Design a protein around this ligand. Structure first.
Ligand SMILES: CC(C)(C)CC(=O)N1C[C@H](O)C[C@H]1C(=O)NCc1ccc(-c2cnco2)cc1
Lengths: 141, 86, 103
């Protein structure tokens, strides 16, 4: 269901990483499979060639945490007006305090050791349930 | 309109009521002081900073900074966040 | 421009915002509404420095880029008990425990 349309209509796009994360752009191909593309360092930009009706999302390349693009989950290149590329503005979401704490704890403790942490069993399960594109594709469907 | 959130070690944090309602658990504890027997001041002060941060940056076009959490308080902050559902 | 503050005295901490252009006295009127003590029974501080009523928060070094929502700047508060002012006292927050081995 969530897949790019095979329009064959070029649409130039600027990916702009206004986050402090290393960004992984992910293209959803014509069968819905996530295809990763070269990463963007914090604060950097790239002019790229894409197509109308194509679907993109953006993640932290290291942890796969979710990121927003023009304030939403998904970005679809539209018709270029007067030769101008489309701006894909990639930013941090406002994470819940809990998801933000999970990010930091994950960054400090190797998954082998999540069970050694003195916390309720439901939080060990929250730590293990990493962010992941497949899970979000099912959710967004 | 303000509410008072009191830490386990007796620090009294005064915050706007609507900021505190960020937390569903606090809303329920209010329905206007709340004592938190398990949340020490070095965790609760951060919780209050999160409320300010969320209210300010939710629905905002300006670039969003990372919310900072020192390694030393991360574990306790997580437990607090989970209890408070925020 | 908004500045985000913690107004702190003893074991009391007020989270609030104010304009960079607003005055020290105006911040005392905010404190007055919350803690029910008039401006003349208050002294406000930046670190150990006593702030003058007519000065803007900006002039006293509370700027939008330092007094941030996620990291607010501290303004110290002391009350006058009857005739004379107490000294500035801010109880520190609790200490975090040792990092667990796994962290
Ligand atoms: C089937 C296809 C992969 C050939 C279709 C295609 O050409 N695509 C899919 C997307 O619409 C993007 C486009 C594409 O691959 N363009 C080339 C390209 C090269 C580098 C980058 C890039 C550079 N930095 C991050 O991403 C992006 C696009």
């Amino acid at each position: 269901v969530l897949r790019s349309v095979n329009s064959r209509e070029p649409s130039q796009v600027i990916f702009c990483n206004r986050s402090p994360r290393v960004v992984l752009p992910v293209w959803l191909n014509f069968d819905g499979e996530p295809q990763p593309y070269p990463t963007l360092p914090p604060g950097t930009g790239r002019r790229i060639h894409s197509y109308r009706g194509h679907l993109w999302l953006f993640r932290d390349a290291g942890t796969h945490d979710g990121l927003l693009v023009n304030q939403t989950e998904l970005f679809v290149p539209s018709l270029n007006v007067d030769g101008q590329p489309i701006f894909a503005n990639i930013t941090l979401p406002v994470y819940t305090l809990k998801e933000r704490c999970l990010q930091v704890v994950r960054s400090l403790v190797k998954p082998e050791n999540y069970r050694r942490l003195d916390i309720v069993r439901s939080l060990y399960e929250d730590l293990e349930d990493h962010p992941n594109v497949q899970k979000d594709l099912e959710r967004l469907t | 309109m303000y509410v008072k959130l009191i830490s386990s070690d007796g620090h009294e944090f005064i915050v706007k009521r609507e900021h505190a309602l960020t937390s569903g658990t606090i809303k329920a504890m209010l329905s206007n002081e709340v004592n938190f027997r398990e949340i020490p001041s070095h965790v609760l002060s951060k919780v209050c900073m999160y409320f300010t941060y969320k209210v300010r940056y939710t629905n905002s076009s300006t670039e969003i900074p990372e919310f900072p959490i020192a390694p030393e308080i991360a574990l306790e902050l997580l437990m607090a966040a989970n209890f408070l559902d925020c | 421009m908004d500045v985000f503050l913690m107004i702190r005295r003893h074991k009391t901490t007020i989270f609030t915002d104010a304009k960079e252009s607003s005055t020290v006295f105006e911040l005392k009127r905010i404190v007055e509404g919350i803690l029910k003590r008039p401006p003349d029974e208050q002294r406000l501080y930046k670190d150990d420095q006593l702030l003058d009523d007519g000065k803007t928060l900006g002039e006293c070094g509370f700027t939008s880029q330092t007094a941030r929502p996620q990291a607010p700047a501290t303004v110290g508060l002391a009350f006058r008990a009857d005739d004379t002012f107490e000294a500035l006292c801010i109880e520190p927050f609790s200490s975090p425990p040792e990092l667990p081995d796994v962290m």
